[PDB]
Amino acid sequence: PLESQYQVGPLLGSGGFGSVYSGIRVSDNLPVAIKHVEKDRISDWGELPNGTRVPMEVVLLKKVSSGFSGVIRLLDWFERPDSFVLILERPEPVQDLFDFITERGALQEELARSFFWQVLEAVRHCHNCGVLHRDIKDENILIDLNRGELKLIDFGSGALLKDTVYTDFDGTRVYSPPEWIRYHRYHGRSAAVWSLGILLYDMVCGDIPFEHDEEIIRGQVFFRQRVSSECQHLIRWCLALRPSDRPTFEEIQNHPWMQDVLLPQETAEIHLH
Ligand SMILES: Nc1cc2c(cc1Cl)N(CCC[C@@H]1CCCNC1)c1ccncc1O2
């Protein structure tokens, strides 16, 4: 009954993830996003408790969707002969962080601190639920403009979190760590911290630090606008070439730069309204 349960609105975007449309749940007028993924384009499959074979994203979103978190919720899913359709939460009004940075430029540090903090909390939640995102980036963060609340999207490159080495990767290369580039090997948490360093740089500078593999491997960061000494230190720590030299999530959240974070509502009042 997909076609009767949802009224389809405009296409929001398309890309490697599939095609995502604005929609409304007709029963209660709930705003949703409707994500279509072609079966031929799914490399990574999971299985539900009842035996049903599904995209990994469905498995991972179910693992994280219990209680509140900074993760966009899976509301329902449908199988068609050549595709899966996922029904996702849709804040309104909303803008992805890539579009936000593109429009507004480099973020003020107070704003970046609030956003970065919320991303860390959401990533911690995923990890606590046994899920590794593997594609943390501005394009995969939604901002609820009224509430100042950030939500993670697109678990299509994700995996079950494990303590042994990953030798597969299908996330975004420019957010991928040097050990992936050089050895095609990474561990989950330390690779996540690398991507968070890329993200933080992106927030405070308005662009990502590395384009080419050679730049990633060299790992040297330069600043084109004024960024505080403490923020620069945190970025450079997250981007340590050796995975063991990177901070843990606890170390990031205890860093001097991360102190005195604004709550989401205050963040929206100051920066978004
Ligand atoms: N609610 C919701 C839920 C979403 C997504 C968007 C919204 Cl609004 N998207 C993003 C679609 C592309 C964006 C749209 C805006 C313009 N810039 C490009 C997803 C992309 C991939 N996997 C899950 C997604 O889930």
XYZ file of C-alpha atoms and ligand atoms in Angstrom:
298
model
C 0.000 0.000 0.000
C 2.982 2.482 -0.358
C 1.172 4.599 -2.996
C -1.997 5.040 -0.866
C -0.190 5.621 2.480
C 2.022 8.508 1.236
C 1.491 11.567 -0.906
C 4.682 12.162 -2.895
C 6.078 15.684 -3.177
C 9.132 17.160 -4.910
C 12.422 15.303 -5.390
C 14.824 16.510 -2.671
C 17.917 15.042 -4.288
C 19.566 12.121 -5.922
C 23.026 10.611 -6.061
C 24.911 7.444 -5.135
C 22.371 6.926 -2.343
C 19.386 6.713 -4.737
C 16.572 9.254 -5.020
C 14.911 10.956 -2.094
C 11.495 12.677 -2.265
C 9.552 14.918 0.086
C 6.363 13.220 1.223
C 3.466 13.313 3.648
C 1.973 10.393 5.548
C -1.714 10.727 4.566
C -3.098 9.188 7.789
C -1.787 11.955 10.092
C -0.101 14.488 7.714
C 3.371 13.626 9.123
C 6.235 15.076 7.051
C 8.457 12.292 5.663
C 11.250 11.654 3.187
C 10.871 8.787 0.745
C 14.128 7.132 -0.272
C 14.282 4.818 -3.295
C 17.260 2.497 -3.727
C 17.665 0.239 -6.775
C 18.375 -3.399 -5.818
C 21.172 -3.624 -8.443
C 22.960 -0.746 -6.657
C 22.971 -2.463 -3.209
C 26.331 -4.154 -2.522
C 25.775 -4.571 1.217
C 22.821 -6.655 2.416
C 21.630 -7.591 5.889
C 18.972 -9.946 7.186
C 16.143 -9.191 9.606
C 15.382 -11.470 12.638
C 12.482 -13.039 10.689
C 14.828 -14.044 7.781
C 13.945 -11.284 5.275
C 16.887 -10.010 3.171
C 17.132 -6.160 3.199
C 19.596 -3.312 2.497
C 22.127 -2.893 5.326
C 20.671 0.594 5.908
C 17.385 -0.960 7.111
C 19.217 -3.210 9.621
C 21.366 -0.325 10.874
C 18.527 2.165 11.201
C 16.453 -0.351 13.170
C 19.428 -0.885 15.529
C 19.644 2.848 16.338
C 15.964 3.918 16.121
C 14.988 3.001 19.748
C 14.288 6.132 21.820
C 15.501 9.630 20.926
C 18.770 10.343 19.145
C 20.374 12.664 16.607
C 19.659 10.048 13.895
C 16.842 10.398 11.354
C 14.354 7.607 12.186
C 13.265 4.811 9.851
C 9.460 4.894 9.995
C 8.717 2.086 7.500
C 10.124 0.343 4.471
C 8.735 -1.415 1.391
C 10.122 -3.876 -1.139
C 9.363 -3.536 -4.850
C 10.557 -5.948 -7.544
C 13.633 -3.835 -8.459
C 14.006 -1.471 -5.480
C 13.507 -0.790 -1.772
C 11.694 2.236 -0.494
C 12.545 3.671 2.939
C 10.255 6.072 4.808
C 12.291 8.514 6.914
C 11.578 11.288 9.365
C 11.630 14.805 7.876
C 12.086 17.884 10.075
C 10.438 21.035 8.662
C 11.999 23.499 8.084
C 15.306 21.724 7.331
C 18.597 22.219 5.511
C 21.545 19.869 5.109
C 24.864 21.075 6.487
C 26.516 21.079 3.049
C 23.898 23.516 1.716
C 24.124 25.573 4.918
C 27.915 25.973 4.683
C 27.653 26.605 0.920
C 25.145 29.429 1.537
C 26.592 30.956 4.708
C 30.338 30.219 4.458
C 32.617 29.277 7.368
C 30.697 28.914 10.643
C 31.311 31.052 13.711
C 33.064 28.874 16.333
C 30.171 29.021 18.796
C 27.895 27.599 16.088
C 30.445 25.009 14.969
C 30.910 23.925 18.614
C 27.190 23.304 19.038
C 26.880 21.453 15.732
C 30.039 19.410 16.223
C 28.954 18.460 19.764
C 25.596 17.207 18.486
C 27.325 15.167 15.769
C 29.589 13.573 18.412
C 26.531 12.676 20.525
C 24.813 11.091 17.508
C 27.910 9.125 16.498
C 28.306 7.916 20.102
C 24.685 6.798 20.053
C 25.261 4.809 16.815
C 28.393 3.174 18.251
C 26.572 2.337 21.498
C 23.911 0.604 19.411
C 26.570 -1.377 17.475
C 26.437 0.704 14.287
C 29.276 2.338 12.362
C 28.137 5.078 9.925
C 31.296 5.195 7.699
C 30.277 8.362 5.814
C 30.132 11.188 8.302
C 30.202 14.427 6.272
C 28.293 17.693 5.865
C 26.012 16.177 3.178
C 24.875 13.552 5.692
C 23.845 15.982 8.427
C 20.435 17.652 8.524
C 19.718 20.784 10.518
C 16.237 21.279 12.046
C 16.287 25.074 11.562
C 13.670 25.824 14.250
C 15.047 23.594 17.017
C 18.769 23.834 16.227
C 18.911 20.008 16.273
C 21.172 18.004 13.947
C 20.317 14.579 12.595
C 22.454 12.006 10.802
C 21.305 10.524 7.486
C 22.386 7.885 4.957
C 23.497 4.674 6.564
C 23.895 3.042 3.123
C 27.704 2.805 3.545
C 27.490 1.702 7.169
C 28.380 -1.516 8.922
C 27.956 -3.374 12.152
C 30.586 -2.015 14.518
C 33.400 -4.488 15.207
C 36.823 -4.380 16.931
C 38.747 -6.004 14.077
C 39.990 -4.400 10.855
C 37.706 -3.226 8.018
C 39.063 -3.850 4.492
C 36.043 -2.560 2.542
C 34.991 1.080 2.190
C 32.353 2.799 0.083
C 31.974 6.128 1.915
C 33.393 9.450 0.713
C 37.090 9.290 -0.248
C 37.996 12.868 0.820
C 36.769 12.040 4.368
C 38.614 8.686 4.420
C 41.730 8.250 6.503
C 45.322 7.806 5.362
C 45.442 4.150 6.480
C 42.551 3.398 4.057
C 44.306 5.292 1.267
C 47.667 3.589 1.870
C 46.798 0.090 3.139
C 43.075 -0.466 2.452
C 42.703 -1.171 6.192
C 41.129 0.804 9.054
C 39.476 0.319 12.421
C 35.985 1.802 12.883
C 36.306 4.331 15.698
C 39.669 5.799 14.707
C 38.494 6.187 11.083
C 35.345 7.890 12.427
C 37.508 10.349 14.393
C 39.493 11.166 11.234
C 36.208 11.974 9.390
C 35.145 14.154 12.346
C 38.376 16.128 11.969
C 37.566 16.672 8.291
C 34.066 17.763 9.284
C 35.255 20.206 11.938
C 37.724 21.811 9.513
C 34.882 22.046 6.987
C 32.651 23.795 9.542
C 35.169 26.452 10.638
C 36.821 26.981 7.218
C 33.876 26.523 4.837
C 35.610 23.825 2.776
C 37.277 20.457 3.299
C 41.062 20.416 3.832
C 42.040 17.660 1.359
C 41.213 16.978 -2.271
C 43.911 14.540 -3.460
C 45.227 11.297 -1.976
C 48.711 12.885 -1.640
C 47.280 15.615 0.639
C 45.482 13.055 2.838
C 48.668 11.002 3.227
C 50.727 14.088 4.080
C 48.060 15.105 6.618
C 49.135 18.761 6.817
C 46.390 21.254 7.498
C 46.543 24.973 6.634
C 44.059 27.642 7.688
C 42.782 30.286 5.246
C 40.727 32.204 7.848
C 40.984 32.998 11.492
C 40.402 29.895 13.655
C 41.249 29.782 17.382
C 44.381 28.039 18.595
C 42.267 25.508 20.548
C 40.056 24.619 17.584
C 43.140 24.202 15.361
C 44.675 21.921 17.999
C 41.537 19.723 18.085
C 41.391 19.485 14.282
C 45.069 18.545 14.053
C 44.596 15.932 16.811
C 41.641 14.297 15.052
C 43.702 14.273 11.834
C 46.738 12.531 13.404
C 48.294 10.354 10.663
C 48.740 7.417 13.049
C 45.292 6.122 14.174
C 46.603 5.549 17.714
C 47.560 9.254 17.981
C 43.921 10.365 17.477
C 41.651 11.239 20.368
C 38.918 8.980 21.646
C 35.351 10.372 21.601
C 35.733 11.110 25.317
C 38.960 13.014 24.669
C 37.243 15.079 21.975
C 34.325 15.979 24.242
C 36.723 16.862 27.092
C 38.909 19.074 24.882
C 39.157 22.766 25.947
C 37.501 23.874 22.651
C 34.398 21.770 23.425
C 33.637 23.382 26.808
C 30.532 25.579 27.353
C 28.528 24.263 24.413
C 25.160 25.872 23.705
C 22.040 23.738 23.812
C 20.272 23.275 20.456
C 17.391 25.711 21.142
C 19.766 28.528 22.226
C 21.856 27.762 19.132
C 18.787 28.231 16.890
C 17.754 31.476 18.666
C 21.233 33.051 18.191
C 22.273 31.645 14.794
C 19.331 30.210 12.861
C 16.201 32.353 13.577
N 14.304 14.157 5.831
C 15.357 13.830 4.952
C 15.859 12.634 4.945
C 16.976 12.336 3.998
C 17.461 13.230 3.159
C 16.844 14.614 3.170
C 15.874 14.856 4.010
Cl 15.160 16.442 4.053
N 18.501 12.874 2.264
C 19.112 13.891 1.401
C 18.650 13.989 -0.018
C 19.651 14.931 -0.735
C 19.821 16.319 -0.104
C 18.426 16.981 0.034
C 18.453 18.503 0.210
C 19.396 19.112 -0.835
N 20.735 18.545 -0.729
C 20.755 17.129 -1.015
C 19.034 11.556 2.317
C 20.154 11.110 1.457
C 20.589 9.862 1.544
N 19.987 8.925 2.507
C 19.038 9.303 3.279
C 18.524 10.698 3.177
O 17.490 11.049 4.052
